[PDB]
Amino acid sequence: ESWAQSRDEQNLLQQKRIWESPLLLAAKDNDVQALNKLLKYEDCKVHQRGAMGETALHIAALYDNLEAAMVLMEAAPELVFEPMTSELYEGQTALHIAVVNQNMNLVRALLARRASVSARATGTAFRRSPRNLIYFGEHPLSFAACVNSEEIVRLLIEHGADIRAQDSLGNTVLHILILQPNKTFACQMYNLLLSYDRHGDHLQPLDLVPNHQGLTPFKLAGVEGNTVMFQHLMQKRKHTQWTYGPLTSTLYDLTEIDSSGDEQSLLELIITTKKREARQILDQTPVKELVSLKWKRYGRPYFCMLGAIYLLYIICFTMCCIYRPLKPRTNNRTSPRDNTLLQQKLLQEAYVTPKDDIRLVGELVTVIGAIIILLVEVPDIFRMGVTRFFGQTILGGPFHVLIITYAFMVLVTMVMRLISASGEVVPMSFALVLGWCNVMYFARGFQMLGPFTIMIQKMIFGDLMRFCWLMAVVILGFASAFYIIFQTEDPEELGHFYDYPMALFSTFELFLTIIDGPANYNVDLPFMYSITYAAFAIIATLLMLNLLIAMMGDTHWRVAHERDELWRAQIVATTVMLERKLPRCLWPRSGICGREYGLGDRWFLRVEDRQDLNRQRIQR
Amino acid sequence: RRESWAQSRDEQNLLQQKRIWESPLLLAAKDNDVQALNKLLKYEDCKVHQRGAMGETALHIAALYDNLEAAMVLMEAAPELVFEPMTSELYEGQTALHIAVVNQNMNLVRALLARRASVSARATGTAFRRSPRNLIYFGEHPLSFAACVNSEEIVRLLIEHGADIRAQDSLGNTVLHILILQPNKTFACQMYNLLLSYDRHGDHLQPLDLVPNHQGLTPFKLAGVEGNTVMFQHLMQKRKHTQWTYGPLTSTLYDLTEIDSSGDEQSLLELIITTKKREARQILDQTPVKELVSLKWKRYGRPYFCMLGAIYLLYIICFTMCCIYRPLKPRTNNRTSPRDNTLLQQKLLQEAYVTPKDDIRLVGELVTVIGAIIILLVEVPDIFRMGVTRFFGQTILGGPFHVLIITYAFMVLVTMVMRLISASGEVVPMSFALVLGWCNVMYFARGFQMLGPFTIMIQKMIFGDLMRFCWLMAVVILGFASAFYIIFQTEDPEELGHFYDYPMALFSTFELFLTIIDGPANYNVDLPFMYSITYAAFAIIATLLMLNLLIAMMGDTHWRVAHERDELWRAQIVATTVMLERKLPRCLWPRSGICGREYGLGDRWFLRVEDRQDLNRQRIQRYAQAFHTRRSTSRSSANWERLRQGTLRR
Amino acid sequence: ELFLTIIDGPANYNVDLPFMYSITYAAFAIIATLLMLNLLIAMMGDTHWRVAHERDELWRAQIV
Amino acid sequence: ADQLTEEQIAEFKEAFSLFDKDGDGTITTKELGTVMRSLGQNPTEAELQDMINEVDADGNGTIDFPEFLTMMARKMKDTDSEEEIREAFRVFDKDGNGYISAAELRHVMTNLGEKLTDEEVDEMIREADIDGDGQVNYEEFVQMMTAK
């Protein structure tokens, strides 16, 4: 709220400064005859800062007043050499404004008076944000290349520009050309900046130099999701080898795409970011084949061997929960009368049995398995997600949360068996249905079961965390309505509703119809019941439950195009993860080394494709 | 074991490039460098027979990088340079003439034929053989290359300089076979007509468009197996024999000498049905073949498929009533296994057919054993012949109803054993033989157009959106069934006995997944507290989440594959008519068509189709004037623009 | 009735059913509620929007 | 004719088909006169000889399909299209014949979701079809993808 209020009371305040000032209003419009009158005074108090710190020359610049701006420069002190000395518009010189106004003769007139081509326009409405509609940059040539001014970039370089110009975020000028929304005109201005870049003082030149987080222009085109700029950068790294009729051969340099051993790569940065256009670089011409080489060869044969160890782990956890030690009850079942059926209790400490020694192996396996999960997952959340910054890993991938909770509940029921606590079935009931439903994680190396596990986590957090708010509205109203009808009644004939906890679990099963319903037929039921259960059966069994079939049915055909690229982005997230954890003796480097075959020190992957001979007749 | 192949080809292409830069003449040949070739070839130690990484000389590099100016220098200096095929396990045979051809244009191909070239050069290597491998299959011989690159000027230039238009390949494919299986079909038709023009009526015994390959398969039957709809319409224009044109009414006369099911020669309808490559079923909607199958189905195909649909249906009822009236005898000892775990009170008779009622069943039981052998004598000679289970990878994977009817006649002859040797477990093989027996009534529901495309959809759910569901069902009902078991392990299984045994706990949890029982509830004993939580989670992600999603999967699929099933059903009419024509004798099935003896057209069978053709004056006005020398629309137009930006932005 | 789930299902714990029943009812739990009852929801759901232009102009001929 | 793509040849071959009413690849002087009479205008039997001997480069009096194809380069329509549209048609056209079908537009709509019924697909063609065959040409498809 507070920022939008602060803008609008200040964008109108500097307009109020114009109407109360003689020459600022004479700069708002042309007004040439009164402008000569005012300047021949004793002292005009020429600075007289308004609401954002601008002079009369900035007003003549911003409202495209070329006629007034020529006049003020002869009667000028250092106004030409002068930033806006205030908040949000800060550092913005008159050279900056005339550049963004896209066509000026004042930009030649200002730089005639040796104007500052180095001026840090670091206010608050220049920083990239959702608060600010434009990230034009920080420097004049950062401005001029983004607004597609061909002539001014030719003219700023001529008057001694600042072609590198790292910034508050460390962004180079070529970084800011990727952050623009008009992707086509960026491709023309990209090559125009490298022509004046050539060489001489190496410093890994400007298509290599990173920003203040570490990111080349090629890697920044990937993260933000720029696709038209991405194919233009690929042309520099490809290398055609031989053409044989249709059958060509390209020798793509696989340097900034493949993770060497460290030092975050392009494939590791598409996954961590979450933009929709970000997961589209995964269908371009070197990246499409690179994933399918690492998944066919060292992917699925290391992800099916890893899935078969986990399923052999979850059975030796289940079988030591089936044969868990119990003893008959020694507490005199006259304890509350006719209302309990507990006939067997839990042993204190009794392992002297050869059957128990075989089981004792089975518990010691599944406990060591509970440490190793917390040694490969919890040291990752120490550095990123300490207590609540795991929230991104909460919402992004749920299988981090479930596999930690599984190894946590094993350690909770490890403490309760060492100190002989009472309730072990409360940890184990969580420890089983969490532990078997993690086999759904290993349903992503299969095109059979791939896009079905994505639809399950879309229904739960899109169409069943929606239906279960208007379900609990219904089944708490009727559950308190059915309770107060059968309250003045025998609870041994139709005992569905005899206390308010069980009346919430009768009505919950009547909403989903997984019980038959209250019907005795040997006793006269209350008259109010047959009315209000008829109205219950209509808005549960007939209205809302068949509405949820029509909503899961409508969503499933609507985002079926989306799940087919949500699955192929889960192949990359699995390919990268096994690449990091596994050593270097297994998992050889993808590609072909280029040292032996006299080409360099890089890593190369080639592709050979036919180009459909009618295309050659279009290449006339 | 097989992925070293993709590496080792890519090892050679880089090793080829390295040998170029570490050589004076090859680097001179990769570029033009016409000053440098005259510089080097006046020396003595220059090996002009320099073998690179594949066998490449200087002229190949001059050709593959199409340097015709560098080619003229090398042909003057090296005489044996049009010769010398490559050697390595990749490209073999391939001379400099092939490379000058494949680039669709060279003046070198006019130059090399002048310098005594070699057009018999079989380019047979591991890079010119069709497979899920190399992206191209152009052929072996230099004419086969010039044909399938759309080179109309080069093929005329090859036959004049002593070519061979007939010579086959390692596969046995001729020139005209290669033109059919190219991916550019309409330019293959113009090259087809040109390559027959230079045949000039050879006396070579069925001239060149009847000659088979090593499989034994004409060019006309190669447009059909592969899926060439463009070639099949072109090859048919030689067959038709159009009779008369009474205004807007023609009467063509097709030639069923290779289309119709002939004798022991495998006809064209027998080759499409026994083939993959889904584009092959597009041939079954073509103007001689659509009218042939429909006239073999309405007449002789359907009334025989109902007289087999009724003999089999009177066979199952004769087999059902021999299971209903099977022999039972009361229990002997006296309930020896303890109470509450034993309720069977009959048992099976050792051998007792001594009553007049059993001899009626003895008639009925001998029918279903004789009929069981007949099933195993008409289909098991295909599993006797084409492999047991290792060589037999065809009919198991192809036809689902083959398996169910061999299984049926296996379960009857298990029961034949157990009745004679007097076993005990006879209730088990009769449990299979009834559900297997009555679900082959689903086989005889493909001739009825109503029930036809419904059995198509059922086998696309079983092998589709139900085994995409049955894996993530068995995950859930192994988790929760082990969760409901351990809670009720410490309880009393006499008022709630759904979970007292882990085979039983799998059975009640599977039923609660489908809601085909009610649910554990007592309402007289206060249940365990953890049950009310873990069943409430199991009620949401089974009844509300995962079962209603399975309605959404079968509902999304059914409108997507909704015209494929009408293509799959009409391809099972062909699969039925061909089968019924073979196994039935010729005395019941007349050969379709009209003979040519008494009408004086030869020995070949014909089929007459008449069709009121058309109008559209507007079309023929556009072409004859060249000859002439000296609202639902608003709904439809909205659908075009949704395709328009849907296409130009992708 | 088991094909349509308009009764529960043959289940009589405290006596042991024969072994072949739980196999052949599990296959009749699938060609069932699961397969051929949800296919009928999809088939009636497919047709209800295919003929939706027709069922209106077939109603206007039930006024004439 | 040195520039003809796969589309216009697949249109001219079908245009050669309905114009030829004896099934082979030879246009007689008589069967050219059969079509001309159906246009309402009459031949004179020397006008038929005029139009055949205009382009009969081999010298047989029977217009073969290569001499028919180079004839439509003389009476050419035009060549003005875009390279992305011609590629977009070959994606839609499954069986490589230069025509889109009623079952070849129900495929494209199904990949885009769009839930089309059989009735609107036949209503799409009635705004696409020009000459009136229920079968979209290449020129009928270029006319819709940029114009209307």
Ligand SMILES: CC(C)CCC[C@@H](C)[C@H]1CC[C@H]2[C@@H]3CC=C4C[C@@H](OC(=O)CCC(=O)O)CC[C@]4(C)[C@H]3CC[C@]12C
């Ligand atoms: C005691 C002995 C038998 C060791 C048995 C090994 C298993 C109990 C553990 C060892 C390493 C574990 C794996 C370590 C890390 C991961 C990644 C983890 O990834 C996520 O959190 C999901 C989201 C994503 O990363 O994309 C999923 C479980 C998995 C495969 C674990 C599955 C269970 C494994 C195989």
Ligand SMILES: CC(C)CCC[C@@H](C)[C@H]1CC[C@H]2[C@@H]3CC=C4C[C@@H](OC(=O)CCC(=O)O)CC[C@]4(C)[C@H]3CC[C@]12C
């Ligand atoms: C959407 C609705 C309008 C369509 C059909 C609704 C009817 C089937 C429902 C609505 C009101 C119901 C009635 C409301 C009250 C009662 C009393 C009910 O119980 C008693 O008779 C109470 C006293 C006793 O048991 O003696 C018996 C059924 C009956 C007639 C109900 C029968 C079912 C009715 C007619």
Ligand SMILES: CC(C)CCC[C@@H](C)[C@H]1CC[C@H]2[C@@H]3CC=C4C[C@@H](OC(=O)CCC(=O)O)CC[C@]4(C)[C@H]3CC[C@]12C
């Ligand atoms: C003892 C008396 C009653 C005579 C018994 C003979 C018939 C009742 C049986 C014996 C042979 C059977 C036929 C054997 C072979 C076949 C082909 C078979 O074809 C397939 O399964 C093809 C499936 C596919 O192609 O996918 C279907 C059943 C059928 C017609 C059978 C139908 C029933 C027949 C005529």
Ligand SMILES: CC(C)CCC[C@@H](C)[C@H]1CC[C@H]2[C@@H]3CC=C4C[C@@H](OC(=O)CCC(=O)O)CC[C@]4(C)[C@H]3CC[C@]12C
């Ligand atoms: C392969 C097809 C049939 C579908 C696979 C789905 C599985 C998840 C289902 C169907 C087959 C079922 C099994 C079939 C046989 C049995 C044995 C049967 O156990 C008994 O002997 C119960 C005792 C009794 O019935 O009295 C019931 C559970 C179980 C494991 C079933 C558990 C659930 C299974 C594995």
Ligand SMILES: CC(C)CCC[C@@H](C)[C@H]1CC[C@H]2[C@@H]3CC=C4C[C@@H](OC(=O)CCC(=O)O)CC[C@]4(C)[C@H]3CC[C@]12C
């Ligand atoms: C978005 C949210 C609101 C989801 C909506 C779900 C609720 C409508 C359901 C889901 C879990 C249910 C609960 C699951 C477990 C229990 C415990 C259950 O057991 C008892 O407290 C009684 C003790 C006994 O049985 O001896 C009483 C009902 C209750 C609160 C259920 C009430 C209805 C709940 C809250």
Ligand SMILES: CC(C)CCC[C@@H](C)[C@H]1CC[C@H]2[C@@H]3CC=C4C[C@@H](O)CC[C@]4(C)[C@H]3CC[C@]12C
């Ligand atoms: C309360 C105890 C006894 C059982 C409760 C089960 C709950 C907590 C567990 C068990 C099954 C789980 C779900 C199983 C499957 C999926 C789909 C996957 O793509 C994301 C996680 C998600 C969405 C899980 C969310 C948490 C979940 C609902």
Ligand SMILES: CC(C)CCC[C@@H](C)[C@H]1CC[C@H]2[C@@H]3CC=C4C[C@@H](O)CC[C@]4(C)[C@H]3CC[C@]12C
């Ligand atoms: C285990 C015993 C007792 C009974 C099990 C029966 C099972 C194995 C049999 C009986 C009914 C059969 C199905 C009946 C119908 C069809 C439709 C057909 O187009 C494909 C096969 C398919 C899908 C069958 C698959 C196998 C099947 C499910």
Ligand SMILES: [Ca+2]
């Ligand atoms: Ca129900």
Ligand SMILES: [Ca+2]
């Ligand atoms: Ca019920």
Ligand SMILES: [Ca+2]
């Ligand atoms: Ca003619």
Ligand SMILES: [Ca+2]
């Ligand atoms: Ca001619």
Ligand SMILES: [Ca+2]
């Ligand atoms: Ca087509």
Ligand SMILES: [Ca+2]
């Ligand atoms: Ca048309």
